[PDB]
Paper text:
Here, by studying CRLs in the SKP1–CUL1–F-box (SCF) family, we show how neddylated SCF ligases and ARIH1 (an RBR-type E3 ligase) co-evolved to ubiquitylate diverse substrates presented on various F-box proteins. We developed activity-based chemical probes that enabled cryo-electron microscopy visualization of steps in E3–E3 ubiquitylation, initiating with ubiquitin linked to the E2 enzyme UBE2L3, then transferred to the catalytic cysteine of ARIH1, and culminating in ubiquitin linkage to a substrate bound to the SCF E3 ligase.
CRLs are multiprotein assemblies that contain a core ‘catalytic’ CUL–RBX (also known as cullin–RING) complex and an interchangeable substrate-specific receptor. Different members of this E3 family are denoted as SCF combined with a superscript name of the specific F-box protein in the complex (for example, SCFFBXW7 denotes an SCF complex in which the F-box protein is FBXW7).
Author numbering:
A (entry chain K): 5 to 73
B (entry chain C): 17 to 55, 84 to 148, 157 to 340
C (entry chain S): 2 to 33, 38 to 64, 82 to 160
D (entry chain L): 13 to 153, 156 to 298
E (entry chain P): 27 to 93, 181 to 190
F (entry chain Y): 175 to 321, 325 to 343, 346 to 432
G (entry chain T): 95 to 401, 406 to 419
Write the structure that this text describes.
């Protein structure tokens, strides 16, 4: 269900995005974005330091994280 | 403006010392007030405050300096008339209260504040002393004109200062507590302490108990017809602490001898009295 | 009972006390032929009609259609009517007139608004560019 | 498995290519589909060598028959066959010439395709290529139209950033993507979703900004917290291609729609004015 | 307000007969020029060599349908 | 970009002559009159307004109505179903989210079944032979407006629709469009037909004099006409309420 | 009729029925209307959700008398050039905005009556927090994800602020044992809701003990991703008395079974324990302590202004849709 994406990076940060199924995606808050504890509770599984930093209005079921180098 | 001010002042002179003017005059005054506030009425507010201070000082000059029994029949009348006429005046200048006093002082509250500054005159202690003298008829004498007391009591209740303290909440009895209740309670204690002892030194204790109960019921009734309701508890506590709670040893002796006597009824009244006070029955049960 | 309300020119319209009670000023005056030298009969009759229509109220933003058609009248009377409502200090009537004027201003440009309201523009031709510069972020 | 039935006819004709198409019509659901009506009305009005021709319309009680024009091979399978060999440059130039001619005609006649992709381009055994799939056509006079276009692989930054007017410059973007794709046998922008698509476009052509794209910051779905990438050298993006073709691609995948060349303007390129007409080398 | 009539209901089976007699015009010309049984999805004697070409030959467009431990790190998939 | 504007203009000028219906067709109908089609088109504009559709839908619907009646006769009761089918066709061709057949078989007060609507749908497709991309005036007006304030356009479309209410069918849609544009421009601000239009479309004022005076006189007679649904609809502020202005009594041509 | 004869109160009454674009539009009519377009009574509650803008524009707007200034996820990466007076804003929301350190320092060196705040996701610094120390009236606060300040600055801030009702010092990715120590040492005594998650190898036993023996009024607590919490921590919570909402999610050093003891605290209502409890055993926990709610609120609530466009129950009237 949870589909991850490859790492694409610029000269200073390094990124990733993650898709969600319908049941999980129905949970995301549309007012404030999240924090590491929040999305780990959601059910994401990855390293330490990734920061949720954007919401895309047309498609809410996609999350965008980043973490510095 | 100026031309408005003369007629307005004359009209306000008319509203005080009321002669029940006609609604045409009142609409003329209201229209003047509304007209000036459309062209921002700080200046008119200042003039109103000035005029009230002047008039009330002049009224104080006369009628004062009586010291008893006539400071009341003067003060209650003046307070009543001034309150009514000031209420009407607040009615007239109602346009200020909506559009300039809202950016901060209502006219009625200003009038009450000025009358309060008339209260902090010898007119404060004199009237209280005279009321105490009149209620010195706690002994007897159906000459207590309750309309000469309830007016002052209500005035003391009302004048609780409110000028932007927080807001109009409800009962503001600060002035009542700090300028009338204390003296009343102290005098009550003093008089009862004197009379109870002098009566004890001449009579058997049964009549003392009867008189104590009678005075208790009388002083519970008295508050319901004279004073503000937030007074019953403290007065009851003090009158109990004076009429009883300070002759318990005499109570013990009479308790012993009434057990030597054959009265089961002073039993009941004694029980009611001692129950009115704390922890009495233990000494009653123990010698029992 | 009833009260004899006299306009600025004698058009005495006898009106129920419970109807005139709607106006706060008259309410407080009655609390303790009455001329109202700031209202003529033309406005007074319409005010009485409106009050009688709202006499039994409980006591955008969903303007009632009765008032709306009652307000479907030209400019000068609207101006005089707002002033009369302020002078007598009636809440709902002043509110609805203000709301109608607001909705009627909606849509037009500064030129059109300035034209329709007979507003005398001033301090212009050199600073309006600056004031619009203050408002790009709109 | 792989259900369907087709029919042909080869009796006496030079342009003897025919094929029958039947489209189901459910009796009581919206009736005739809007796509069918748009297709038929916009198709029986155009005629051109680089466009599939319609010959007749047959309307039964519950089915529709369209006598299209048969043709041999599309582009996806043709590139898949030559996926390791590459495509001859003159053949590419001829294909691009025919595509540009067809686009010029369609846009002159007020018709928008909006659905161009290699899967809808049909080639003949003589080098001639023609368009198809006019079910998404619409007659534009520019208003605000429908907000669903070709495919996430071939959309344009006009639609992805949710613009309101998408007048006839999106087909140019799709054509450019197809051209670079067949040149390198790789789709330039293999998006997973819209965000992956935008991030890939940025990675290839650098982050847009007011200098590059005027009025980009005010688009409904722009957020300047995007990654700050730089426009890579356009060379290694399209290695096997010369300088003049690079110029044409650079001025045919430009961000701003106004600064994006049209069809007839593109017909006059040097790179392009050199014109051949070979034939396909493999079976069709 | 827009819910209005103009003339009341009118006869209908005459409409059905009229429209179906209308539709009997693409029955002689259809057989003539295209020599195919369109109404029955059947081919005919000829003049148009009818075959059933296999699906992999012609491009797909001609038949396309319409529309303690448990540490905090990354576990690869 | 003007890279295609003149080409599209020329192409439309070419198309408009192929789809022009017959003028004297109306008498051929045994039991229908021009007044009756006027009532039908009035109902039509009412429907088009209340469903919140576009006016180009109305123009295409009336064009299909004309090319159908001018090429086929029918008894009295069927004009309503014909109009509904024309609405369906125009909406599906043009408008983004077309209303369903249920709404149309409802707005006729449930007087006809869905299947008859489908059958006459087949019929109208048959007689038209799937030729629905016809040109109409609004495209010409929108092209003209490029060479101006919103009131001008509101009045222009007003005059055009008043024309399509019912003697104008002699003139081509470009002709009516030009005459309405000139008259509305004069009425709103007195400006005259610019030279660039004469360069582009080739029309001059003299060539459009008859339709221009017809539009003037019918504009005068319109406020007292028996039907004013268009008038009350353009009373709305969306169109700047411009249906209430005065029809000029004499022009300065 | 000359409508320029209207009184100011009626003109304000008229203006108070508009929407922000039109109120901006009417400002350009005549000098009097220009005055009345900014009269500190229409500008109570503003809103600039995500709308890009510029520091001087926002400074002028705040100086006009804003109270409830809501501006989440808007970008201001440009220098601030003008001086102002001390502002009057009370409920300032700036979460997630891409803003510059110098600009944020400039804008915060003016506000001093801040009754509430939120600085989620931003990056702060020593002058930032030093200036922020002046707000001796902060009912709430938030610093989630922020990073950069130092121990001395943190202790000065927390000592200066006393009335602080709820704190959320979460997930900062540059703290150390020193930072968390000074936080728990100098936190105020009124804290109703507190969150200190994230600090995996920095939250230690003595720290939690000091916290619980200092602040007795914690109603909502959470210590997620703390890996050094044990049984004695559980009894530390038993010394607490009003803990209605706990969450020890992903606390890896804890057996699932000792959690049954937690229900013995009387006033508990919720417990979010994601990560430790394996599947199936959740039913075991529920049946073991069925007087609670386990794993039912995925998202925090500690000083998050919005959870619906209303900031902290306050509704904004001037808006941009």
């Amino acid at each position: 269900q949870i589909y991850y994406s490859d790492k694409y990076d610029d000269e200073e940060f390094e990124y990733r995005h993650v898709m969600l199924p319908k049941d999980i995606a129905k949970l995301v808050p549309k007012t404030h974005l999240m924090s590491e504890s929040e999305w780990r509770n959601l059910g994401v599984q990855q390293s330490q330091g990734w920061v949720h930093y954007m919401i895309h209005e047309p498609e809410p079921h996609i999350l965008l994280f980043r973490r510095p180098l | 403006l100026d031309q408005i001010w003369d007629d307005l002042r004359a009209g306000i002179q008319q509203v005080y010392t009321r002669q029940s003017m006609a609604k045409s005059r009142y609409m003329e005054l209201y229209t003047h007030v509304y007209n000036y506030c459309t062209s921002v009425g700080l200046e008119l507010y200042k003039r109103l405050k000035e005029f009230l201070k002047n008039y009330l000082t002049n009224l104080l000059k006369d009628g004062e300096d009586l010291m008893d029994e006539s400071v009341l029949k003067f003060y209650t009348q003046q307070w009543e008339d001034y309150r009514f006429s000031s209420k009407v005046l607040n009615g007239i200048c109602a346009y200020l209260n909506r559009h300039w006093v809202r950016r901060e002082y209502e006219i009625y509250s200003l009038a009450l504040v000025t009358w309060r500054d008339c209260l902090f005159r010898p007119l404060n202690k004199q009237v209280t002393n005279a009321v105490l003298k009149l209620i010195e008829k706690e002994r007897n004498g159906e000459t207590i004109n309750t309309r000469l007391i309830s007016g002052v009591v209500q005035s003391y209740v009302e004048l609780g200062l409110n000028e932007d303290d927080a807001f109009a909440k409800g009962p503001t009895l600060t002035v009542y507590k700090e300028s009338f209740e204390s003296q009343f309670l102290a005098d009550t204690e003093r008089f009862y302490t004197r009379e109870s002892t002098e009566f004890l030194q001449q009579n058997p204790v049964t009549e003392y108990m009867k008189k104590a109960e009678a005075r208790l019921l009388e002083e519970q009734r008295r508050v319901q017809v004279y004073l503000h309701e937030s007074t019953q508890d403290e007065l009851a506590r003090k009158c109990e602490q004076v009429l009883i709670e300070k002759h318990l040893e005499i109570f013990h002796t009479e308790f012993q001898n009434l057990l030597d006597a054959d009265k089961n009824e002073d039993l009941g009244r004694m029980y009611n009295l001692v129950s009115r006070i704390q922890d009495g029955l233990g000494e009653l049960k123990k010698l029992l | 009972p009833s009260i004899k309300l006299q306009s600025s020119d004698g058009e005495i319209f006898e009106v129920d006390v419970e109807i005139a009670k709607q106006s706060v000023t008259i309410k407080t005056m009655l609390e303790d032929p009455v001329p109202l030298p700031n209202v003529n009969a033309a406005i007074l009759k319409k005010v009485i009609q409106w009050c009688t229509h709202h006499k039994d109220d409980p006591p955008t933003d969903d303007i009632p259609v009765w008032d709306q058609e009652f307000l479907k009248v030209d400019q000068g009377t609207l101006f005089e009517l707002i002033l009369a409502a302020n002078y007598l200090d009636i809440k709902g009537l002043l509110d609805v007139t203000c709301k109608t004027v607001a909705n009627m201003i909606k849509g037009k440009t500064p030129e059109e608004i300035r034209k329709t309201f007979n507003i005398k523009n001033d301090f212009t031709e050199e600073e309006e560019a600056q004031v619009r510069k203050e408002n790009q972020w709109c | 498995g792989t259900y369907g039935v087709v029919y042909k006819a080869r009796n006496k004709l030079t342009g003897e290519v025919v094929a029958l198409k039947k489209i189901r019509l459910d009796t009581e659901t919206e009736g005739v589909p809007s796509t069918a009506i748009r297709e038929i009305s916009l198709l029986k009005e155009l005629n051109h060598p680089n466009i599939v021709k319609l010959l007749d319309v047959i309307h039964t009680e519950n089915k529709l028959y369209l006598v299209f024009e048969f043709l041999h091979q599309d582009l996806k399978k043709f590139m898949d066959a030559s996926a390791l060999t590459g495509i001859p440059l003159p053949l590419i130039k001829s294909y691009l010439f025919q595509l540009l001619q067809g686009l010029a005609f369609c846009h002159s006649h007020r018709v928008l395709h909006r659905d161009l992709k290699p899967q809808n381009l049909l080639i003949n055994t003589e080098g001639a290529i023609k368009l198809a799939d006019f079910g998404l056509a619409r007659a534009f006079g520019v208003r605000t139209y429908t907000h669903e276009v070709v495919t996430l692989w071939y959309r344009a930054p006009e639609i992805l950033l949710g613009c309101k007017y998408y007048s006839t410059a999106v087909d140019i973007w799709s054509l450019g993507c197809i051209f670079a794709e067949m040149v390198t046998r790789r789709a330039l922008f293999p998006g997973d979703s819209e965000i992956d698509q935008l991030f890939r476009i940025f990675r290839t052509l650098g982050t847009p900004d007011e200098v590059v794209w005027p009025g980009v910051t005010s688009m409904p779905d722009y957020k300047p917290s995007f990654p700050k990438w730089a426009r890579q050298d356009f060379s290694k993006v399209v290695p096997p291609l010369d300088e003049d073709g690079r110029s044409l691609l650079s001025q045919m995948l430009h961000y701003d729609p106004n600064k994006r060349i049209s069809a007839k303007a593109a017909l006059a390129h040097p790179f392009f004015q050199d014109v051949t007409k070979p034939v396909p080398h493999l079976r069709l | 307000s827009a819910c209005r009539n103009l003339f009341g209901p009118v006869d209908h089976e005459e409409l059905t007969r009229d429209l179906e007699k209308h539709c009997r015009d693409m029955e002689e010309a259809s057989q003539r020029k295209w020599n195919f049984d369109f109404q029955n999805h059947k081919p005919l004697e000829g003049k148009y060599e009818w075959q059933e070409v296999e699906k992999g030959s012609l491009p797909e467009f001609y038949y396309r349908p319409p529309r303690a431990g448990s540490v905090e790190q990354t576990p690869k998939k | 970009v003007p890279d295609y504007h003149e080409d599209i203009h020329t192409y439309l000028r070419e198309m408009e002559v192929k789809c022009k219906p017959k003028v004297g067709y109306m008498k051929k109908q045994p039991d229908i009159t021009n007044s009756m089609r006027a009532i039908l088109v009035d109902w039509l504009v009412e429907v088009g307004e209340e469903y919140k559709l576009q006016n180009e839908t109305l123009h295409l619907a009336v064009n299909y109505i004309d090319r159908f009646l001018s090429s086929m006769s029918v008894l009295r009761g069927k004009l309503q179903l014909v109009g509904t089918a024309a609405m369906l066709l125009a909406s599906k061709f043009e408008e983004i989210y077309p209303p369903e057949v249920a709404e149309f078989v409802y707005i006729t007060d449930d007087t006809y079944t869905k299947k008859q609507v489908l059958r006459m749908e087949h019929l109208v497709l048959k007689v038209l032979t799937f030729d629905l991309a016809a040109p109409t005036v609004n495209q010409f007006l929108t092209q003209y407006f490029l060479h101006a304030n919103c009131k001008v356009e509101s009045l222009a479309m007003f005059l055009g629709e008043l024309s399509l209410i019912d003697p104008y069918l002699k003139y081509l849609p470009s002709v009516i469009a030009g005459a309405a544009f000139h008259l509305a421009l004069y009425t709103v601000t007195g400006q005259s037909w610019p030279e660039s239009l004469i360069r582009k479309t080739g029309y001059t004022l003299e060539s459009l004099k008859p339709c221009l005076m017809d539009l003037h006189q019918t504009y005068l007679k319109a406020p007292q006409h028996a039907q004013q649904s268009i008038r009350e609809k353009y009373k709305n502020s969306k169109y700047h309420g411009v249906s209430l202005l005065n029809p000029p009594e004499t022009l300065n041509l | 009729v000359s409508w320029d004869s209207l009184p100011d109160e009626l003109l304000l009454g008229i203006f108070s029925c508009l929407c922000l674009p039109e109120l901006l539009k009417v400002s350009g009519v005549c000098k009097r209307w220009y005055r009345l377009a900014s009269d500190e009574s229409l500008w109570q509650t503003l809103d600039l959700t995500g709308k890009n803008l510029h520091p001087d524009v926002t400074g002028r707007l705040l100086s006009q008398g804003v109270i409830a200034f809501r501006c989440p996820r808007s970008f201001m990466d440009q220098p601030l050039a003008e001086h102002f007076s001390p502002f009057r804003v009370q409920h300032m929301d700036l979460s997630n905005s891409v803003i510059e350190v110098s600009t944020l320092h400039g804008i915060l060196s003016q506000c001093s009556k801040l009754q509430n705040l939120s600085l989620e996701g931003l990056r702060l610094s020593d002058p930032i927090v030093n200036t922020l120390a002046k707000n001796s009236n902060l009912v709430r606060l938030n610093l989630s994800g922020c990073s950069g300040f130092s121990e001395f600055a943190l202790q000065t801030l927390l000592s200066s602020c006393s009335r602080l009702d709820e704190l959320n010092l979460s997930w900062c990715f540059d703290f150390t044992e020193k930072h968390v120590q000074v936080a728990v040492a100098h936190v105020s005594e009124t804290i109703t809701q507190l969150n200190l998650s994230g600090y995996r190898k920095n939250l230690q036993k003595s720290d939690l003990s000091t916290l619980v023996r200092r602040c007795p009024n914690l109603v909502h607590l959470d210590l997620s991703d703390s890996v050094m919490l044990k049984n004695d921590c559980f009894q530390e919570f038993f010394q607490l008395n009003y803990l209605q909402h706990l969450s020890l999610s992903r606390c890896y050093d804890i057996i699932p079974e000792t959690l049954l003891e937690l229900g013995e605290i009387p006033t508990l209502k919720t417990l979010q324990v994601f990560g430790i409890v394996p599947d199936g055993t959740l039913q075991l926990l529920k049946e073991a302590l069925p007087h609670l709610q386990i794993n039912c609120s995925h998202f925090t609530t500690i000083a998050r202004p919005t959870i619906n466009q209303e900031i902290w129950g306050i509704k904004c009237r001037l808006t941009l849709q």
